Amino acid sequence: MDERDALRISREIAGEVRKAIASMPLRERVKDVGMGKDGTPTKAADRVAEDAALEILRKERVTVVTEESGVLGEGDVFVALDPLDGTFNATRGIPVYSVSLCFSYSDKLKDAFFGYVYNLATGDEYYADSSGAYRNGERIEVSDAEELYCNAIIYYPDRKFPFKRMRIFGSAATELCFFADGSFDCFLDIRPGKMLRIYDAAAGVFIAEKAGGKVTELDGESLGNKKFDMQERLNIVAANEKLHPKLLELIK
Amino acid sequence: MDERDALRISREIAGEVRKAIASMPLRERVKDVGMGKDGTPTKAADRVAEDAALEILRKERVTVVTEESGVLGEGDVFVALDPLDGTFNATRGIPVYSVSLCFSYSDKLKDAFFGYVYNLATGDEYYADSSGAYRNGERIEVSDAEELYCNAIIYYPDRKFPFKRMRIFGSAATELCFFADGSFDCFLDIRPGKMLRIYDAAAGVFIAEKAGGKVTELDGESLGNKKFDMQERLNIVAANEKLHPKLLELIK
Numbered sequence: 001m002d003e004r005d006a007l008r009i010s011r012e013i014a015g016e017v018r019k020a021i022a023s024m025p026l027r028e029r030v031k032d033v034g035m036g037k038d039g040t041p042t043k044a045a046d047r048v049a050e051d052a053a054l055e056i057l058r059k060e061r062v063t064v065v066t067e068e069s070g071v072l073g074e075g076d077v078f079v080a081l082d083p084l085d086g087t088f089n090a091t092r093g094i095p096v097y098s099v100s101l102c103f104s105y106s107d108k109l110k111d112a113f114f115g116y117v118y119n120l121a122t123g124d125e126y127y128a129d130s131s132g133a134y135r136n137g138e139r140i141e142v143s144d145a146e147e148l149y150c151n152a153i154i155y156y157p158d159r160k161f162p163f164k165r166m167r168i169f170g171s172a173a174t175e176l177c178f179f180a181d182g183s184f185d186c187f188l189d190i191r192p193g194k195m196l197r198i199y200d201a202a203a204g205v206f207i208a209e210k211a212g213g214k215v216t217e218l219d220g221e222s223l224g225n226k227k228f229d230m231q232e233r234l235n236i237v238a239a240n241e242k243l244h245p246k247l248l249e250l251i252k
Numbered sequence: 253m254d255e256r257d258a259l260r261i262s263r264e265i266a267g268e269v270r271k272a273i274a275s276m277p278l279r280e281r282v283k284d285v286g287m288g289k290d291g292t293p294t295k296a297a298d299r300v301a302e303d304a305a306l307e308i309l310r311k312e313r314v315t316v317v318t319e320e321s322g323v324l325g326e327g328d329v330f331v332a333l334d335p336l337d338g339t340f341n342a343t344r345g346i347p348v349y350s351v352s353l354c355f356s357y358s359d360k361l362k363d364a365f366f367g368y369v370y371n372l373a374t375g376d377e378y379y380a381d382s383s384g385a386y387r388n389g390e391r392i393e394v395s396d397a398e399e400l401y402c403n404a405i406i407y408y409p410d411r412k413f414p415f416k417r418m419r420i421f422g423s424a425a426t427e428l429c430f431f432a433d434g435s436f437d438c439f440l441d442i443r444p445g446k447m448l449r450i451y452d453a454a455a456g457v458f459i460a461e462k463a464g465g466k467v468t469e470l471d472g473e474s475l476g477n478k479k480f481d482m483q484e485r486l487n488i489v490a491a492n493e494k495l496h497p498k499l500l501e502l503i504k
C-alpha cells in the first residue's frame with residue numbers, strides 16, 4: 001500500500017460514512033447502542049459510521065485501531081481510524097464532525113505515510129502525503145504568527161491567557177486541520193487527564209506537520225513513539241516553530 | 253408591525269444575506285473594507301451581509317441598531333441587527349455563523365416581541381414569538397439539567413471548572429440558540445471586559461427565554477433595561493431555572 005492507495009481508500013470511506021450519517025435523523029444518531037472498546041458509549045451514529053468504514057478497510061491488509069471496535073485484523077499497515085470524530089456535535093446537528101484516518105508502516109506514529117480528515121457536514125477534505133498537505137485539492141500551510149496574542153484552539157483554558165481568540169469546536173481531528181490550514185495559529189490539548197486517543201489525533205497531527213506545523217507533547221517531546229493502540233494517550237502543543245516554544249513556556 | 257410581519261421580514265433578510273455570502277469566496281470575505289461604528293473592522297462579508305439586510309429594513313418604519321453602520325432610521329419599532337454574527341468563522345469557512353435580528357416595541361430589551369437567528373451555513377432557522385421558540389419549524393425548549401457537571405458554552409473559562417464539556421464556537425447569537433434548543437445546558441459570557449453588544453445577544457436571549465431559559469446579567473440582574481444602542485454591553489448567564497442559581501454561585 002502506498003499514499004495513492006490510501007487516498008483512494010480514504011475517499012471511498014468518506015463517501016460511505018457521509019451517506020450513512022446524512023440519512024440518520026438526530027433522534028436516531030444520539031441513541032446509545034453499546035459500550036465502545038475505548039470505554040465510552042458507542043452512539044448509533046458511531047456504529048453506522050464505523051460499519052461503513054470497516055466494510056471497506058476489511059478488504060485491505062491492515063491492522064485497524066478504531067474507537068468502537070478496538071484493534072482488528074493482522075496486516076502490516078496500521079490504520080488509526082476515528083469513524084466519527086465529534087459525535088456530540090453530530091448528534092446535535094452542529095456541523096463540525098469528521099471521519100479521521102492515519103496510515104502508518106508500523107504501529108508507531110513516526111512511520112505514518114498518510115493522514116486524512118473529512119468533514120462529514122461540509123464535505124471539506126483535508127489530507128497530506130509526501131507532496132504536502134491539502135484542503136479540497138489545494139495546498140495548505142500553517143500561519144506564520146509569532147505572538148502569543150493569536151487565534152488559538154485550546155482544551156482547556158484554566159487560567160488567564162494572552163490569546164486574541166480562544167475556540168473549542170468539539171472535533172480534535174478537524175480542529176488540528178483548522179490549525180494546519182492556518183485558520184487558527186495554534187492547537188493545544190493540555191488536559192492533565194491526557195484524554196486524546198491515537199485515532200483522534202494521528203491524522204490531524206500528520207496533516208499539520210506536513211503543512212509546516214511543529215507538533216509535540218506537553219514538554220516539547222516528539223510524538224514519534226506514540227503507539228497505534230487503544231491504551232495510548234496524548235497531550236498536544238502545535239504551532240509554527242517560532243510560536244511553538246513560546247507556547248511551551250506559557251504553559252509551564 | 254407584529255410578530256408575523258417580523259417573521260416575514262426576517263425570512264426575506266435571511267434569504268438575501270444567505271445568497272450574498274454564499275457566493276463570496278473566502279479570500280474576498282476576509283478583506284477589511286472599513287471601520288465599523290462598533291469600533292471593529294467591517295469585513296467585505298460584513299458589508300455585503302449588512303447591505304442585503306438594510307435594503308429590506310429600509311422599507312419598514314424602524315430604528316435599526318446594527319454593527320457596521322450604527323443607528324439608522326427613526327421608526328418606533330427598534331431592531332437590533334447583527335448582519336453576520338461569527339465573521340471570523342465565515343471568513344475561514346467554519347460553518348457556524350448567522351444573521352441575528354431582535355425586534356422591540358421600544359429601545360429596551362424588555363419590550364422585545366420577536367427574535368430571529370438564521371445559521372447562514374446550514375440554513376437552520378431559530379425564532380421565537382408569543383407562541384414559543386422554534387428550530388426549523390419545530391417547538392424547542394431548554395434542557396432540564398440540574399447539575400454543574402453539564403454541557404456548557406462559556407466565554408471564557410479562566411479557572412478549573414466542573415463542567416462535563418466546555419465549548420466555544422465563535423458565534424454568540426447561534427450559541428444562545430444551541431442553549432435554547434437544549435443542545436447545551438447553559439451559555440455563559442463572563443468576560444470581565446463585558447464584550448457582548450446588544451445585536452450579538454438580543455435575539456439569542458429572547459429565543460432562549462421563550463424556550464424556558466432563565467437569562468440574566470452576571471449578578472442575576474434582569475436584562476430588561478439593556479438598551480438598543482451602540483454603547484450597550486452584556487455579560488450573560490443563561491440556564492434553566494434549577495441550574496441557573498448554581499451557576500451564579502459558581503462564578504463568584
Ligand SMILES: O[C@H]1[C@H](O)[C@@H](O)[C@H](O)[C@@H](O)[C@H]1O
Binds near residue numbers: 082084197
Ligand atoms: O474524538 C473526540 C473529539 O476529538 C473531541 O474534540 C475531544 O475532546 C475528545 O477527547 C475526543 O475523544
Ligand SMILES: O[C@H]1[C@H](O)[C@@H](O)[C@H](O)[C@@H](O)[C@H]1O
Binds near residue numbers: 421
Ligand atoms: O458577534 C460576535 C460573536 O457573537 C462572537 O462569538 C463573540 O465572541 C463576540 O463578542 C461578538 O462580538
Ligand SMILES: N[C@@H](CC(=O)O)C(=O)O
Binds near residue numbers: 010011012014018118
Ligand atoms: N471524498 C469525497 C470525494 C472527494 O473529496 O473528492 C467523497 O467521496 O465524497
Ligand SMILES: N[C@@H](CC(=O)O)C(=O)O
Binds near residue numbers: 021024089092122374
Ligand atoms: N450537523 C448537520 C446535520 C445533518 O446533516 O444531519 C448539519 O447541520 O450540517
Ligand SMILES: N[C@@H](CC(=O)O)C(=O)O
Binds near residue numbers: 270
Ligand atoms: N430564510 C429561508 C427560508 C426559511 O427560513 O424558511 C430562505 O429563504 O432561504
Ligand SMILES: N[C@@H](CC(=O)O)C(=O)O
Binds near residue numbers: 151164340
Ligand atoms: N481579527 C483579525 C486578525 C486575526 O484575528 O487574525 C481578523 O479577523 O482577520
Ligand SMILES: N[C@@H](CC(=O)O)C(=O)O
Binds near residue numbers: 343344347
Ligand atoms: N463558510 C463556508 C461554510 C461551509 O463550509 O459550510 C461556506 O462557504 O459555506
Ligand SMILES: N[C@@H](CC(=O)O)C(=O)O
Binds near residue numbers: 416
Ligand atoms: N454523551 C453525553 C450526553 C450529554 O452529555 O447530554 C453524556 O455523556 O452524557
Ligand SMILES: [Mg+2]
Binds near residue numbers: 082084087
Ligand atoms: Mg469518535
Ligand SMILES: [Mg+2]
Binds near residue numbers: 298
Ligand atoms: Mg457581526
